[PDB]
Amino acid sequence: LEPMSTWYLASWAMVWYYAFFFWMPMVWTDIMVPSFVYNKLPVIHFLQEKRAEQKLRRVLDETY
Amino acid sequence: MFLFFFCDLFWLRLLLCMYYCVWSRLCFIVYFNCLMLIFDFLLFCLFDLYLFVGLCLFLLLWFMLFNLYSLILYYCITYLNLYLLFCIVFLLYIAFLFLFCFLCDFFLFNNLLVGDSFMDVFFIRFLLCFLECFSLLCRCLSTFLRLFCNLLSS
Amino acid sequence: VYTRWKCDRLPVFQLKLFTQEYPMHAAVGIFTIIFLWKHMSHCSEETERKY
Amino acid sequence: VLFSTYRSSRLVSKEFLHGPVMRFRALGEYYFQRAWNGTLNWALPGEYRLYAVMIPFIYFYHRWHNDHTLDR
Amino acid sequence: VGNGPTFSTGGECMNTCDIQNAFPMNDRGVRSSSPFQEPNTAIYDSYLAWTYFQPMDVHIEKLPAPEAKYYQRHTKKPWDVSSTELTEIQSRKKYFQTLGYLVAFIYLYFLMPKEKSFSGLSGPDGHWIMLPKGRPELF
Amino acid sequence: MQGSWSVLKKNCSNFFPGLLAFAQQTQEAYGIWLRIYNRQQKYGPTDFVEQSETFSPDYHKRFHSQDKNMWVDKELCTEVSQKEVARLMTYKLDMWRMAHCAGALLATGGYAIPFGLFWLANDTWVPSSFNLTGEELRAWREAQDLYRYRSAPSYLTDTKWHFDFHAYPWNETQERAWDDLFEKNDVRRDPKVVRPAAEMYDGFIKFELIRRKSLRHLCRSMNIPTFPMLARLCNGTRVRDYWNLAWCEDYMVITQRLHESMTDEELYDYAWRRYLAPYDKNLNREQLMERVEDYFEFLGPDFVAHGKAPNLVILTNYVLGYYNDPAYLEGDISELDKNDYDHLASWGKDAFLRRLEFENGPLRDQVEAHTQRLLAERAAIAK
Amino acid sequence: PPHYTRKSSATIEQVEKEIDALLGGAEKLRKTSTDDQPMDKLTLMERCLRHALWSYHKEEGRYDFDQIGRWVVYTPEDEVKLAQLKRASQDKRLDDLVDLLERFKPVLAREAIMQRLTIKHLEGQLGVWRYMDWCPEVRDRAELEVDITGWQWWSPLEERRLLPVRLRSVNEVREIMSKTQAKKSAEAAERNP
Numbered sequence A: 001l002e003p004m005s006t007w008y009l010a011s012w013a014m015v016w017y018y019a020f021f022f023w024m025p026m027v028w029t030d031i032m033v034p035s036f037v038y039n040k041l042p043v044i045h046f047l048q049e050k051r052a053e054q055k056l057r058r059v060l061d062e063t064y
Numbered sequence B: 001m002f003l004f005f006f007c008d009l010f011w012l013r014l015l016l017c018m019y020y021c022v023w024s025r026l027c028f029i030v031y032f033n034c035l036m037l038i039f040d041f042l043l044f045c046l047f048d049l050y051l052f053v054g055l056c057l058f059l060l061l062w063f064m065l066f067n068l069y070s071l072i073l074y075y076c077i078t079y080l081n082l083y084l085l086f087c088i089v090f091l092l093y094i095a096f097l098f099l100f101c102f103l104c105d106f107f108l109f110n111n112l113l114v115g116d117s118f119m120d121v122f123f124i125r126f127l128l129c130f131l132e133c134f135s136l137l138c139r140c141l142s143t144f145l146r147l148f149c150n151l152l153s154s
Numbered sequence C: 001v002y003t004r005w006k007c008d009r010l011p012v013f014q015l016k017l018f019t020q021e022y023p024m025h026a027a028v029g030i031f032t033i034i035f036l037w038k039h040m041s042h043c044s045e046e047t048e049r050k051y
Numbered sequence D: 001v002l003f004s005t006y007r008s009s010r011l012v013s014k015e016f017l018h019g020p021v022m023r024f025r026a027l028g029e030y031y032f033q034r035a036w037n038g039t040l041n042w043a044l045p046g047e048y049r050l051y052a053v054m055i056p057f058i059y060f061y062h063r064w065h066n067d068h069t070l071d072r
Numbered sequence E: 001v002g003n004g005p006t007f008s009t010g011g012e013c014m015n016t017c018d019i020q021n022a023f024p025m026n027d028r029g030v031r032s033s034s035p036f037q038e039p040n041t042a043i044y045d046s047y048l049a050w051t052y053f054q055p056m057d058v059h060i061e062k063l064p065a066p067e068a069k070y071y072q073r074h075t076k077k078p079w080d081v082s083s084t085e086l087t088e089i090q091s092r093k094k095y096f097q098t099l100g101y102l103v104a105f106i107y108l109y110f111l112m113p114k115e116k117s118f119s120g121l122s123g124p125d126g127h128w129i130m131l132p133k134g135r136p137e138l139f
Numbered sequence F: 001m002q003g004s005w006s007v008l009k010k011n012c013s014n015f016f017p018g019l020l021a022f023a024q025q026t027q028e029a030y031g032i033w034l035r036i037y038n039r040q041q042k043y044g045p046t047d048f049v050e051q052s053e054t055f056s057p058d059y060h061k062r063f064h065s066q067d068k069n070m071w072v073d074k075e076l077c078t079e080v081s082q083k084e085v086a087r088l089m090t091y092k093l094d095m096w097r098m099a100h101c102a103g104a105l106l107a108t109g110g111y112a113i114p115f116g117l118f119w120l121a122n123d124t125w126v127p128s129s130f131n132l133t134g135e136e137l138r139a140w141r142e143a144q145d146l147y148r149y150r151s152a153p154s155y156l157t158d159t160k161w162h163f164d165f166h167a168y169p170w171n172e173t174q175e176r177a178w179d180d181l182f183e184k185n186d187v188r189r190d191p192k193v194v195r196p197a198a199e200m201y202d203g204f205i206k207f208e209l210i211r212r213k214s215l216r217h218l219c220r221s222m223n224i225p226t227f228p229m230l231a232r233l234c235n236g237t238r239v240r241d242y243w244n245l246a247w248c249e250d251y252m253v254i255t256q257r258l259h260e261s262m263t264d265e266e267l268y269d270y271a272w273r274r275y276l277a278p279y280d281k282n283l284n285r286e287q288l289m290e291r292v293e294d295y296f297e298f299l300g301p302d303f304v305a306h307g308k309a310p311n312l313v314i315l316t317n318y319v320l321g322y323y324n325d326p327a328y329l330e331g332d333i334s335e336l337d338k339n340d341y342d343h344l345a346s347w348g349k350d351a352f353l354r355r356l357e358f359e360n361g362p363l364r365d366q367v368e369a370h371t372q373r374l375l376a377e378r379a380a381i382a383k
Numbered sequence G: 001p002p003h004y005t006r007k008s009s010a011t012i013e014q015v016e017k018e019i020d021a022l023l024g025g026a027e028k029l030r031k032t033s034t035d036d037q038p039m040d041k042l043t044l045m046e047r048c049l050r051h052a053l054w055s056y057h058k059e060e061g062r063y064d065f066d067q068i069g070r071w072v073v074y075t076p077e078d079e080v081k082l083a084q085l086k087r088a089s090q091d092k093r094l095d096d097l098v099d100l101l102e103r104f105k106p107v108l109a110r111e112a113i114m115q116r117l118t119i120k121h122l123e124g125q126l127g128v129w130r131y132m133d134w135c136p137e138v139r140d141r142a143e144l145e146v147d148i149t150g151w152q153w154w155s156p157l158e159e160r161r162l163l164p165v166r167l168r169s170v171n172e173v174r175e176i177m178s179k180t181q182a183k184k185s186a187e188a189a190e191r192n193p
């Protein structure tokens, strides 16, 4: 079994180390952070609409 | 000895580039618990408890691109080696453990001494502490062993 | 507004990611790489013939 | 001073290879940017036709490689 | 109406999601798939339920164009890159990456020979590197 | 700011005059610091002088306590003037950056020269003494302001997001204060409205519990070098020293009303050192006085009465809110008349898309009625 | 009273013309509703602007009761005062009205931008990049939150604080104005003895 072997373990592990050190940043910037920003957008939009309505309501409430 | 080889993800890398040049929402995550650690409100942690989210997401993507697609005949799991998985788990587990140890807070380890003051310290509590310190490393080993054995047997 | 992931180029973001986000993990990985190439980078002729 | 650390320092014009790039993006977006194409951790899409197309293709090229390079 | 995509949903049903309040609800009682107001949003039931919005031709009373003074903010900075520009940059980069990966895939799976063949007709058997040169005292 | 060849020429030309000026400023600042340090050791409280230890309740890590490890010398005007304190603060910033550069030089020997070329090509990390004319000083200040703009929003977002995600205000007044604290600089925040946020956050995170990442963001926003960051109690010490000096000068100015007699340029510098007045805003004396008075009001009566300032985290967020510009929006509204997915028009609609359009289009009600009637008929037939 | 210097120069006629122009473009969008129902942004802006304008006019001397009874009456005490009825302060009020108009204009601009964005969304011709460019605040907040390790997309506590926010009804406005008038009167009483 090669899965139990060690005669070329370093070169074999270079695949994981390249994935970790060089490909993970690309996936981070190109795929993951974009998806999570996209997920964030709706709630932030809703909260900021509510904040603007709150400002308008306070503006109206101070009139007499 | 220097062996030059390539992973079996090149077509999947091509598909990722083609299908993720534009943004898309993600709403289904294999391990969602990394995002919600605190369940009672008004509780907060001064430690960087959300540092694992990025590594978790990348690890899930990588292991899924390998393991799930390996069901297709002649698809190769390029990393399927016991000691390589040991290296991966060593990196993650020991890195987090050293993050907690570099904090230089020894009281953090008070809970390792299992039991209460009623129990004899040398013959019960100290032996339990020895076993628990052993169990941390055994948890690392068992994690990587379980991942390797399941794939191999299946 | 400024964000590392959106404004910095890829090499710069890589350095920032592994120096101010995951420095301990990078250190442990480099340690393991050195160990592997120090103790797991040799193969005898008989080992090559067998496997 | 030699190289910029900011992605905003452009090396080409905005219209460089606009047409081919738009065709490539059209190919990417037509089936993937859909409500029912909800992925599981970016690896398993929701669109059925992606499976229907990609499973045979992956098997075909892997089998060709195995038959002509490995089992040979 | 066109065939273009809309605001991404991730395959989620907004009537039961954890952020459902952020999605407006229409007269029919179906929460929108986007922050916008949608009149014809629907829900489809596969193994899992998912919300879908079908674009359609609808006329909306268009408030007249405001002056540039009241919506333009000239706070741009040298590091700033807009989402449109980022999309352009990433599109070009991914186009070139896709071409390169395609060439790599073709070579790897159809042209590259495997090393150390039994017959010796294909692939290299390996060789030594970093051998000394011009160092007689070494031996 | 990005590096440029003109700035490189400027800093190379003024390198040695700048070093000589820095040395002279070092002598003067050492004298000023010696006076202040002697006064602190002699007249300071026992906790402040003995450096009492304040540990966090979770991991028992020591950090500076605002109440115990910071002390406002109310009678410092007798020994040290306001201008001397300002000089010491400016020199502390310049000395920190120079010290980091000297450490790099000593560490790497002669291999730091190309990095020195990168260093002199930008005004971000060069001392103020390298500018020998007004225009050069203006460009240097512009670089400092640019770095502040780059760094402040991350600090503000970190604070706001962590609190909002893990806690909520107790009462309506705290809610209003918290919401108005993080408004953009295009609107004027009322310090009386925003002050309760200080106590609300004192309940959450005091300065003694500030996290290392938040500290890094804050030091970036304050033009304090962050590499090597090291333990959080080093840059934390720098922050504490800078704001302790600032509070001493603030007490002097408030008590003696020096700002009213302060000239325009000196007033602008005073506001700038408090991170209240960017130079690119081209503020006049009215605006500067308004911002300074708001800062004094935010400090509150208790500052003069007892020398106790509000929570330092909230204070830093408040002052750095002046560098939180509105999000940029460029382009005429007519650009919204275009289309984004014309490149897909050639593809048309497939069978599934046509089905979705048919079922969810204007005829959706008719299709739904027909489908439900057909299903009901089939169910009845089945039974 | 002490003299007050105006921050900006503008005539009352110019201000009224500007208000009419601002409210005239939104007539099609403006929709009437029951007095007890919640009000819209256009209704709130119109009420505030007209209230300030007619308060200034009544202080000046242009006693046009027909409009004053509509744009200024919100309390039974106010109605009684109107029935009985039937310099520095003025300058400050005019400046405040001008500032209020300049404050409302950006809100209408954002509303128009959102209308156009919605129009393009319903057509299927709106990319997320365009939406983020034309809604910069949302874009910046999301990007910053993710960049500082705020991955989560749900904010239950802030929503709990802001979820029940909505524009008030006319009757609620009347009650709040009555409360404020009572508070001001009580304040002047304390001022007196």
Ligand SMILES: CCCCCCCCCCCCCCCCCC(=O)OC[C@H](COP(=O)([O-])OCC(O)COP(=O)([O-])OC[C@@H](COC(=O)CCCCCCCCCCCCCCCCC)OC(=O)CCCCCCCCCCCCCCCCC)OC(=O)CCCCCCCCCCCCCCCCC
Binding pocket: A011, A012, A014, A015, A018, A019, A022, A023, B002, B003, B004, B005, B006, B007, B013, E096, E097, E098, E099, E100, E101, E103, E104, E107, E108
């Ligand atoms: C002596 C014989 C030769 C060999 C000499 C070797 C010397 C060795 C020295 C000693 C080293 C000891 C240690 C070795 C440890 C090895 C461990 C290991 O392999 O681990 C597995 C592990 C497997 O990783 P993986 O998961 O497969 O991912 C890595 C992949 O590269 C894919 O990962 P990725 O996709 O994430 O990578 C990013 C990728 C992102 O994606 C892309 O950019 C897409 C493209 C991908 C390219 C890379 C994939 C390669 C695919 C196979 C080859 C393709 C075809 C080649 C054709 C050859 C024909 C003969 O971008 C790039 O790759 C950037 C480069 C792009 C180049 C584009 C060039 C365009 C030229 C255009 C010219 C036009 C001219 C016009 C003129 C017109 C005139 C009129 O390997 C690594 O991690 C990398 C190991 C490298 C170690 C360093 C070796 C030293 C450097 C050698 C360079 C030799 C150059 C000279 C060759 C000349 C021809 C003979």
Ligand SMILES: CCCCCCCCCCCCCCCCCC(=O)OC[C@H](COP(=O)([O-])OCC(O)COP(=O)([O-])OC[C@@H](COC(=O)CCCCCCCCCCCCCCCCC)OC(=O)CCCCCCCCCCCCCCCCC)OC(=O)CCCCCCCCCCCCCCCCC
Binding pocket: F026, F029, F030, F033, F095, F096, F098, F099, F100, F101, F102, F103, F104, F106, F107, F228, F234, F237, F238, F241
């Ligand atoms: C030749 C061998 C070299 C060895 C290798 C070195 C490798 C490089 C490592 C860095 C070395 C230092 C570089 C120069 C720094 C400049 C001097 C200095 O301390 O500036 C003050 C300044 C103090 O900072 P702070 O945060 O305000 O301090 C808080 C205290 O509470 C402040 O106290 P305070 O609040 O009460 O205020 C007092 C203040 C009041 O004073 C003033 O206000 C007046 C101004 C005084 C300071 C002026 C500094 C000017 C800096 C620029 C110099 C010009 C550069 C010109 C460049 C161009 C040249 C052409 O005066 C001070 O700043 C005094 C600070 C304490 C003295 C520190 C010096 C101790 C070492 C020297 C003695 C060694 C004796 C060896 C005996 C051997 C026996 C066997 O220092 C810094 O900015 C810190 C350095 C920043 C870089 C850190 C890099 C990592 C360091 C790791 C070291 C680990 C151990 C070593 C092994 C490393 C192996 C990996």
Ligand SMILES: CCCCCCCCCCCCCCCCCC(=O)OC[C@H](COP(=O)([O-])OCC(O)COP(=O)([O-])OC[C@@H](COC(=O)CCCCCCCCCCCCCCCCC)OC(=O)CCCCCCCCCCCCCCCCC)OC(=O)CCCCCCCCCCCCCCCCC
Binding pocket: C011, C012, C015, C016, C019, C027, D001, D002, D003, D004, D005, F001, F002, F003, F100, F101, F102, F104, F105, F112, F113, F115, F116, F117, F118, F119, F120, F121, F122, F124, F125, F227
């Ligand atoms: C005469 C002068 C006066 C006397 C001297 C005075 C003293 C001077 C020294 C002190 C100066 C301090 C201030 C310096 C400020 C400038 C720093 C800087 O670099 O700024 C970025 C600077 C531009 O700055 P900027 O435009 O002003 O923007 C500044 C902004 O504020 C943007 O700011 P930012 O904050 O965004 O940027 C920060 C960024 C800074 O970083 C960067 O920006 C990256 C720069 C490199 C980018 C390279 C991109 C290009 C790559 C090309 C690759 C090759 C292409 C092909 C070439 C083919 C050639 C044939 O990120 C970082 O700070 C990351 C720090 C990472 C630290 C790493 C620590 C590792 C520790 C290891 C672990 C240890 C653990 C403990 C273990 C203990 C065990 C016991 O970047 C450049 O200019 C890039 C230069 C690229 C050069 C060409 C490519 C490399 C050439 C290598 C040649 C090798 C030859 C030999 C080969 C031999 C082979 C055998």
Ligand SMILES: CCCCCCCCCCCCCCCCCC(=O)OC[C@H](COP(=O)([O-])OCC(O)COP(=O)([O-])OC[C@@H](COC(=O)CCCCCCCCCCCCCCCCC)OC(=O)CCCCCCCCCCCCCCCCC)OC(=O)CCCCCCCCCCCCCCCCC
Binding pocket: A021, A022, C010, C011, C014, C015, C016, C018, C019, C020, C023, C024, C026, C027, F100, F101, F103, F104, F107, F108, F111, F125, F216, F220, F225, F226, F227, F228, F229, F230
């Ligand atoms: C897509 C592919 C592209 C290519 C990818 C390339 C491949 C990358 C693969 C792996 C990448 C990740 C590796 C991570 C490793 C682990 C890192 C880690 O554990 O970090 C812990 C930790 C994290 O860093 P941090 O301080 O918390 O903050 C990092 C942030 O990035 C700070 O950010 P910040 O925002 O807070 O501050 C911003 C700003 C703030 O500005 C300032 O603070 C003012 C300016 C400060 C100037 C520097 C002051 C230094 C003071 C003394 C430092 C201690 C010296 C110790 C003794 C010397 C030891 C050699 O700071 C800067 O701009 C820093 C400028 C530094 C420029 C240099 C960056 C590296 C470029 C490459 C140059 C070297 C090439 C050598 C190899 C080739 C040879 C032919 O690091 C430290 O504690 C720092 C200790 C520094 C010790 C000195 C360096 C030791 C390493 C050996 C140096 C060898 C020199 C060779 C000379 C030439 C010989 C021929």
Ligand SMILES: CCCCCCCCCCCCCCCCCC(=O)OC[C@H](COP(=O)([O-])OCC(O)COP(=O)([O-])OC[C@@H](COC(=O)CCCCCCCCCCCCCCCCC)OC(=O)CCCCCCCCCCCCCCCCC)OC(=O)CCCCCCCCCCCCCCCCC
Binding pocket: B104, F060, F061, F062, F063, F230, F231, F232, F233, F234
């Ligand atoms: C190329 C150069 C290579 C260099 C290599 C050397 C390593 C790197 C050098 C330095 C690099 C720069 C950065 C270093 C870290 C900076 C940390 C920091 O920011 O501290 C700020 C901090 C300033 O903040 P602060 O508010 O003033 O005070 C801290 C607060 O108290 C804080 O309050 P707190 O509430 O946090 O209080 C807690 C605090 C309390 O502690 C302190 O803060 C006090 C200072 C430290 C005291 C440490 C000594 C404790 C007593 C030792 C007793 C040993 C007895 C043994 C007897 C044997 C008899 C046979 O921390 C602790 O409790 C930690 C105690 C240490 C525990 C050590 C456990 C080790 C376990 C070993 C495992 C097995 C190892 C392998 C097997 C070995 C045997 C076979 O700095 C310090 O306090 C001192 C910093 C000293 C820096 C290191 C200087 C390096 C000198 C190098 C000389 C040798 C060079 C060799 C070169 C070789 C050729 C190249």
Ligand SMILES: CCCCCCCCCCCCCCCCCC(=O)OC[C@H](COP(=O)([O-])OCC[N+](C)(C)C)OC(=O)CCCCCCCCCCCCCCCCC
Binding pocket: A006, B083, B084, B086, B087, B090, C031, C032, C034, C035, C036, C038
């Ligand atoms: C067919 C047989 C199969 C056998 C299978 C056996 C299992 C193999 C498993 C392999 C995969 C998993 C590997 C996990 C990682 C293991 C790590 C490990 O044990 O490595 C230890 C090894 C020990 O190194 P070493 O073996 O060179 O030790 C030297 C000791 N002498 C000189 C006495 C021989 O670490 C390394 O290889 C890395 C060393 C370099 C990096 C560290 C340098 C700093 C050291 C600090 C202390 C000393 C200096 C003073 C302080 C600093 C001053 C600047």
Ligand SMILES: CCCCCCCCCCCCCCCCCC(=O)OC[C@H](COP(=O)([O-])OCC[N+](C)(C)C)OC(=O)CCCCCCCCCCCCCCCCC
Binding pocket: B015, B016, B019, B068, B069, B071, B072, B073, D043, D044, D045, D050, D051, D054, D055, D056, D059
């Ligand atoms: C989220 C859950 C996903 C579940 C997906 C379920 C898919 C159901 C597939 C049904 C059968 C498909 C048959 C395909 C036949 C192809 C031609 C052929 O000869 O193949 C025979 C091959 C092998 O059949 P064989 O073993 O009989 O071959 C005989 C050949 N000799 C005799 C020479 C040995 O069939 C397969 O291997 C098909 C197994 C499919 C298992 C499911 C894989 C799912 C994971 C991959 C998903 C990929 C999605 C990518 C999308 C894009 C991502 C960005």
